[PDB]
From a paper:
We previously identified EilR as a regulatory component of a multidrug efflux system from Enterobacter lignolyticus, a bacterium isolated from the soil of a Puerto Rican rainforest because of its ability to catabolize lignin components. In its native context, EilR regulates expression of EilA, an inner membrane transporter that confers tolerance to imidazolium-based ionic liquids, reagents that enhance the microbial conversion of lignocellulosic biomass to chemicals. EilR belongs to the TetR family of transcription factors, which commonly regulate divergently transcribed adjacent genes. Amino acid residues 1–192 of each monomer form 9 α-helices arranged in two domains: the N-terminal DNA-binding domain consists of residues 1–52, forming three α-helices, and the C-terminal ligand-binding domain comprises residues 53–192, forming six α-helices.
In a similar manner to the EilR-operator complex, we used crystallography to investigate the EilR structure in complex with each of two cationic triarylmethane ligands, malachite green (MG) and the most potent inducer CV. Structural analysis revealed the binding of two ligand molecules per EilR dimer. The ligand-binding site of EilR contains several Glu and Asp residues, a distinctive feature this repressor shares with other transcription factors that recognize small cationic molecules. To demonstrate the specificity of these negatively charged residues for ligand binding, we created Ala substitutions of EilR and examined their ability to de-repress RFP expression via PJExD in the presence of MG and CV. While the Glu90 and Asp175 mutants induced RFP to a similar extent as wild-type EilR, the absence of Asp163 caused a dramatic decrease in expression, suggesting that Asp163 is required for EilR to recognize the positive charge of these inducers. While several of the EilR-inducing dyes, notably methylene blue and malachite green, inhibited growth of E. coli at high concentrations, CV, acridine orange, and pyronin had only minimal effects on growth rate at concentrations required for full induction. Comparison of EilR in its induced and DNA-bound forms showed a significant conformational change around the ligand-binding sites.
Numbering used by the authors:
A (entry chain B): 4 to 192
B (entry chain A): 5 to 192
The structure:
Amino acid sequence: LNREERRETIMQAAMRVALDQGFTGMTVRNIATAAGVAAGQVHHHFTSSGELKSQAFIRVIREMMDLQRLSRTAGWREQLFSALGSEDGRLEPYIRLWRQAQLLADSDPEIKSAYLLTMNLWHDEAVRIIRAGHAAGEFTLRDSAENIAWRLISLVCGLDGIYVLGMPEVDDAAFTRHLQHVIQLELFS
Amino acid sequence: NREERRETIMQAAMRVALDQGFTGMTVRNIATAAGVAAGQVHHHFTSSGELKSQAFIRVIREMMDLQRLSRTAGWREQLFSALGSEDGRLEPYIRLWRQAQLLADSDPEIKSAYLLTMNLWHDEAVRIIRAGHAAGEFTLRDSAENIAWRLISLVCGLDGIYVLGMPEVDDAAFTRHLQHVIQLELFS
Ligand SMILES: CN(C)c1ccc(C(=C2C=CC(=[N+](C)C)C=C2)c2ccccc2)cc1
Ligand SMILES: CN(C)c1ccc(C(=C2C=CC(=[N+](C)C)C=C2)c2ccccc2)cc1
């Protein structure tokens, strides 16, 4: 195992620890355990535990973007709705982490940078889908795919920030309804 | 006396909230900003958290009172002003509100208050939407409540991205997006 592959195995272990315990639980001891190596090796391959935490978080969100993706043959409406509000049960720990990364972004510079980067990734996926569906003729763009993507992502972020508070008139069903509706308005004139 | 000193103490809490945020809302500083002894605030407010939360609610209520327009301007302008004004003087209010949304994750009292301010915001948006629909200016393809939730959600999200320093999401871009979604929601 060359150095890149040790760095990599440790990174993946850190991804599991992130999805199982969150940011608080990503101690070098738990990461070293999950990777099956001695802590000293984790310190030798990742000199900043903070940097390791952030990069692992980024990789987790990337994996979330790959897990939510549908087959190319699927309708473009369905694809976009998956990339924004997928109800797939496998995504729970990822979302739970992303949410956390938001909060800790207020008090941790590195986590804030990583969170911004993940927002850019989310946007990239949404734009990709909007462009493909536009070229296919299913979506109707009266604005650029970038702006539309930022507005949809904003809708999801706000509706989630309200969903977590426990308001009854905004529940899972309401969430999906709203997201589908804004998609209809933005791309099906 | 009874409610007037309570009101002066509340005004103190509000000023300290707009000036420093929740962290600086200590009874020792609030009492000084009110010109009273530190114990009287304990006479008037059982829990310090109760004071922080109630004063926050009052701050947001005042924000909404400042953002309400002359009732004769176009309904679109009233709604927008109720949603997304770019006035710098509001940033101390906005700041506080942001702070609240964060502390709601770790403080049930501030959580209750924050929920309450969100419902107030909602009630205002619904008011303007219904009034504009009656006036024939707004065209509703959905209930004013759902439209309100989607618009407020747009504002909250775009704010969350705006605070990160995203260059493509700045003041101007924010305005553009909000205007656009209003156009889609009420002018089909
Ligand atoms: C960090 N951040 C602001 C957020 C991050 C993610 C989410 C998500 C989500 C979508 C619908 C939900 N529903 C159905 C309640 C719950 C979460 C989500 C976003 C994209 C793809 C799949 C799920 C929301 C907010
Ligand atoms: C805590 N929370 C979810 C939020 C609290 C306040 C805001 C606001 C706002 C609107 C536009 C902005 N721009 C132009 C950057 C900045 C703040 C805002 C809300 C209502 C009236 C005026 C401004 C947004 C989110």
